Amino acid sequence: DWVIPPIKVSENERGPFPKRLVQIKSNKDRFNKVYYSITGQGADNPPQGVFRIEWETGWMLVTRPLDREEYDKYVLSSHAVSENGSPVEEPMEITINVIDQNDNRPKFTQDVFRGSVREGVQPGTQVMAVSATDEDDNIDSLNGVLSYSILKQDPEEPIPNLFTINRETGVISLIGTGLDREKFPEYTLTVQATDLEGAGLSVEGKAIIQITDANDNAPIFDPKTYTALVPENEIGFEVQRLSVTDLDMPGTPAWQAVYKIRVNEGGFFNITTDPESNQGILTTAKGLDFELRKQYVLQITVENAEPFSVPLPTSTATVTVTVEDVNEAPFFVPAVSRVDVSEDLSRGEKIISLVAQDPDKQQIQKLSYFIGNDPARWLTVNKDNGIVTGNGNLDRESEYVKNNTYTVIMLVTDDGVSVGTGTGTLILHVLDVNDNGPVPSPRVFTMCDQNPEPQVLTISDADIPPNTYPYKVSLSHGSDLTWKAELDSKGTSMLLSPTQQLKKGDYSIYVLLSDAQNNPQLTVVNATVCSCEGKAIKCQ
Template sequence: LENHRGPFPMRLVQIKSNKDKETKVFYSITGQGADSPPVGVFTIERETGWLEVTQPLDREEIGKYVLFSHAVSANGQPVEDPMEIIITVTDQNDNKPVFTKQVFVGYVEENAKPGTSVMTVNATDADDAVNVDNGIISYSIVSQEPPRPHHQMFTIDPQKGVISVLGTGLDREATPNYTLIVQATDQEGRGLSTTATAVIEVTDANDNIPVFDPTMYEGTVDENEVGLEVARLHVTDLDMPGSPAWQAVYRIKSGDQDGAFSITTDPNTNDGILRTAKGLDYETRSRYDLVVTVENKVPLSVSLGLSSASVLVLVRDVNEPPVFVPPVKRVEVSEDLPVGHEVTSYTAQDPDKDQRNKITYRMGSDPAGWLAIHPENGIVTAVQPLDRESVHAINSTYKAIVLAVDNGVPDATGTGTLLLLLQDVNDNGPTPEPRIFDICSRQPEEQTLTIVDKDLPPNTYPFEAALEHGSSTNWTVKVSGQDSLVLKLQKELEPGEYSIFLRLTDSQGKAQVTQVKAQVCECEGAAENCQQRAFTATAIVEIRDAIDNIPVFTLSWARPPLPHALSLCAPRSFHRPLGHRGAKQPLAAGGPLRAPEGAGCSQGRTRAAGHRHPCYRHAEEAPGPPSGAGGEPGSVPRAAAPREAGRSDEHGLPAVILLTAPRSLHVPGPAHALWALGRGRLGRRQLHCGSTSPGCQKNPQNPAGLGSASPRGCGAARARVPSGHRGVPPARPAQPGRSVLG
């Protein structure tokens, strides 16, 4: 028996061997409580065999001990096999029940029916509940707070500890929670007991409908306004704020057959926000009488009906812009419509019928300026020729924007889109592309050009091609395929630029004569072999009044590329005193003007134009100038700025220009080449060739030799210097066969 009060040691049982008559027997025990922990709880008298307990026992610590008794002779030899001894500690009710929690929390929905399980409480007891009832627990409810609507709203299962609803009338809005004191008693309710707290939270059920407060609303909105707040509807709901049973859902029950309004819930205030879902039209409907209902997100737990409210919406009239009918108008019109003729009539209607506004028309967007519209009747006329091939006509369609402005307050503007579908007429002759090409003078390849016709079929191919203005002397032409032609050179030509006049005719007889430029190069076969092309230019001679009265010439060209040498055509030698100590120096025909000593070249040699290579004695030895020198075709760039000898200016023009003459030419003073070391003031005059001298060969493409850059095509040199220049007599007119300078 646990908790025995003694005295100790207390005898329990005597162990005795039947061999003790034959020999002296000694007893001992082993096992838990003897020689194993807890050691010494049990002992045995060595000679008598009495088993004794030395202290009170606690069943809750060790309910059963297993020992083994041993019997041996005086010499220690066993006289018996070990015997098992089982000691069972009988229970005393010495432990109270213990709840697993001091506070239990449970939940129950309001309006729950009797018998609805709420929660379970649990307690344990260390005493024996198998052999005796010391550990059998019984549960009970000691108290309930608050005791409403009555003091026994809940009950508890005495064996299982399950708390359930006993009475009716749970209402979260009245009593949101209950506190119960529950008791656990062992020995089936007759023994020791303990208590704990059970808190029951009453959860919300949707047992309250949202109610409009107030139930009538009124709002005013301008017509055509979309998404505008018309009214804010307020409701009250006794259910738990924020819960689905409290959250409101609004619906428009009647009065909005055309879906002009929408209503949503404000998540913070639970109000209903009524807005326009589309623009309202005062002329169609000026007021709306709406009925709005409200319910919760979750269904009602009881049938209580729905709350409703009335909303009066008044539509305010505003000045609306005129509306074109149709908003996009497509009109087919021929591109050769005469100027001043009517294209179409494009009018708008004013939706504000009661206001009777006047509409005025004008063009809003007319990219090409082709159209005009009558301000009163909306008739569109052509004020400029239409052109289907214009960049303003995309895919043969011209887009214009027409405006209609009423005189309301404030005025309103409507827009309409006018699309002119331009019908093609044969107003463009075919033309060749490209308009300029390179070709070798010997055994040239055929040149294939593309025929371009801006018109549409059938005003295009098949094409016919012919040569005009004597071009057939040197060339032949034939149409190749659907949109190509082939030009062929019939005989060898001198290098230069030649004009070819091509007459192309489309299938409807529309013809166009186009000038094509052929650059004939001194080469054979493919045009890619052309390395030096014919060059013509206007030379600009700048006469700089140097400090020592020695003129320095610089030249620039109107177009690249630059020649290796430029011929100043002088049919006869001439002398021109320029005030430099009265000296004169002739220039041999075909020879270059040489730079003076100290100009970067050794005596008697000339530096190549635009190069830093060694100087050359003759122009033919010098390499060509840098590529890209000169200006755009047809323009005259600024003259080369003074720079050190042998350098190029910002346009890539050489600083030293070699001039050759077909006959001797006398230049006063030291032999200055045309290098840009000039100083002082300058005069600027054009230099060009006149009639051909015996020393020049006439170019058939340039019979006058004008602007020729080839040593073979030159005439009388002609230049002008400001009259009165120091040591320079007045200018004299040029005569055939003679050169005049000054």
């Protein structure tokens, strides 16, 4: 058909109501009276009564103002019946479009936006982002397009133009330079959005930016030069602690100190760090020792764990140390294999005039010499002059003496001012003299009767050679009660044989030898005889 165009109507209209929109006519009215009515939402349906028609003229009206924001369009159905009561025309659809008007102010997405950036970054860096909206049209008008802006950053210091915002997108960026968490950490700037691309109505928001941290700062010592005293030897011990103040953020690696000495003399120092006021705690690496050095001039520089965000001054601490003195024990010089001395020494004679030395050249402390180790008592010391003399009777020949030795240990004490011990061994070579003289091996026989065979006997000397070289056998009172002497060819033994057919048991034979001579006297080597033929038998 020839339909009927949609009807545009403005919003928030205002004048004298009613307002005729249009007029409709059924031509089938030649016959009876026609009754015009109309139906739909806004008509008889909810919102009832916005539009109504004059049953007799065919006029359509808007009865009151409208807000497209509420309902932006309506569709209606129109009718025409006869007085008799019958419909005449197939109904007719009707449309109305509600044209937008700038009745709406915009509104920010949130009531407050927050942001953060680091202090050391470069100009032209994107920080935050902000939103807002207008409910009016924005597809055929500007009643709903906004334009963003900024008008007041607080801390109007260092300067007041650190940022800008993209008018269309509302994004903010760092424009200037001079950000420092250490002086001004959080800005609060006021934003506004406007109707018709900055032309219409405006509103406010608030965005707040916190500033991350940077290693803008270096560490600073609170003393620059310290001093402490120290002892030579127990040690590995705490000398002095140090103080400092970095200014970036505390629990952070831009706040933790790292040290080191420049030069470690004997490399006898270690230094650690501590999460207190991360003071510098210095200590001794390997004890000290001395009388060698009293002075210690060393320097320690301090850094952070992480590198610096800028060239900065490295700052050292210069420190002086002094070693207190402890006084140590003295010592005999050697451990003496000294005196190759003979057995004939006169009880009270100079053996070893000895001396001991003591470390501490503070030496105005003497000591006393004491002896100590010990198989039995011979020797003697002058305690205030360390003089070892030889008292007593010695005898290389016999008991304690093991290999050609006699080892003895002695002491010495550090007095004068405190304490001390000195353990020193002393081996002294004893010597030989020909003391003893020759002696027979077996002392009792068992001779036989009829024809006894030679009674083997031998010789032994306690002395050391030559002193036991060859012999000379001799028979004293009974050199004839019949007894005849004899030597083995290979030196050592002697052959003892009677020369008479003598008696039934129990009787001695006086013996007498010599080796350089010395002559011993020996003696009786008794002789038990019991009935027989010729071989030395078990007796009775």
